């Protein structure tokens, strides 16, 4: 039981919201894999009329590429309670967010006969703090 229930990270997204780019470089260096541009919707009085146009970038880290980045990422931040997602996710910031969830998650991300995860199998803020905390750092 405990095994197929014990958490893990599915993806760590690093993103810089700018609004007009040259910032890609650093992420390619710090993560270890290419980045991707960010667009937007709706005109913005802040001279943000052009709808589809570069505004930021991001990178999704999976498996090692993710951990290896976290070993250094996590330390650089002071984690708090009000910094957690009801689904066991946390963002802090250059932004760095982490998507955590129990084993059989593919069930929802696949194509064929997918299904949403029962509120029970959903990770909890608590179960999140624990798992993470139990990996080189403190809570509170």
């Amino acid at each position: 039981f405990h095994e197929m229930r014990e958490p893990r990270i599915e993806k760590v997204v690093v993103h810089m919201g700018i609004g007009h780019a040259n910032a890609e470089d650093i992420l390619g260096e710090i993560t270890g894999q290419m980045p991707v541009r960010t667009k937007a919707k709706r005109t913005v009085g802040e001279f943000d009329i052009r709808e589809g146009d570069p505004i930021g970038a991001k990178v999704t880290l999976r498996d090692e590429m993710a951990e290896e980045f976290l070993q250094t990422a996590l330390p650089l931040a002071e984690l708090a309670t009000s910094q957690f997602d009801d689904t066991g996710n946390f963002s802090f910031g250059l932004d760095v967010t982490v998507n955590l969830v129990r084993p059989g998650y593919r069930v929802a991300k696949r194509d064929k006969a997918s299904r949403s995860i029962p509120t029970k199998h959903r990770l909890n803020p608590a179960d999140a703090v624990a798992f993470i905390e139990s990996t080189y750092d403190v809570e509170v």
Binding site: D111, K112, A113, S114, R115
Partner: protein
Amino acid sequence: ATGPRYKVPMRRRREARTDYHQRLRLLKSGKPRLVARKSNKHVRAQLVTLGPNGDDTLASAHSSDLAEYGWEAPTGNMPSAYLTGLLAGLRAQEAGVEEAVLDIGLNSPTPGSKVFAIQEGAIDAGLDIPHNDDVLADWQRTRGAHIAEYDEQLEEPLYSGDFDAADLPEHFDELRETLLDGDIEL
């Protein structure tokens, strides 16, 4: 769910198992659907005809009963898929079925995928199905060359139970061979 004005999707759509929009286009041809479906360990290939209470299955072919003829290898690969196709293609040939349209379900039209490889077997069995040659995988990957040359990158057996270390795509030929036999109890 919420109230009366609410709209609950057709069951088979909730379940996310049938793509009706695509289905319709299929159903139009009038020809029977050559249902091709995968599974982690298996591969099925049904030949469906339309009915008054629901679809009818005039001829199937499961990768499991593929061993029933002498298959000692796995049941979720190209060699597997092809064969299963040719098997159902034959059985169907035994029901009066002559043509069909490939129904790859919710799978993807990827080039050389097991589905097209399944479709290739039913064609070879004698059935008439609208296809696209250059979308099918190369005769070898159909055999198991892609996998055999993988065990070449040995150091650790490609398999658990011993079917063999280097694997025998020849076996593929051996089985295929056994199917073109008139006798063979279908």
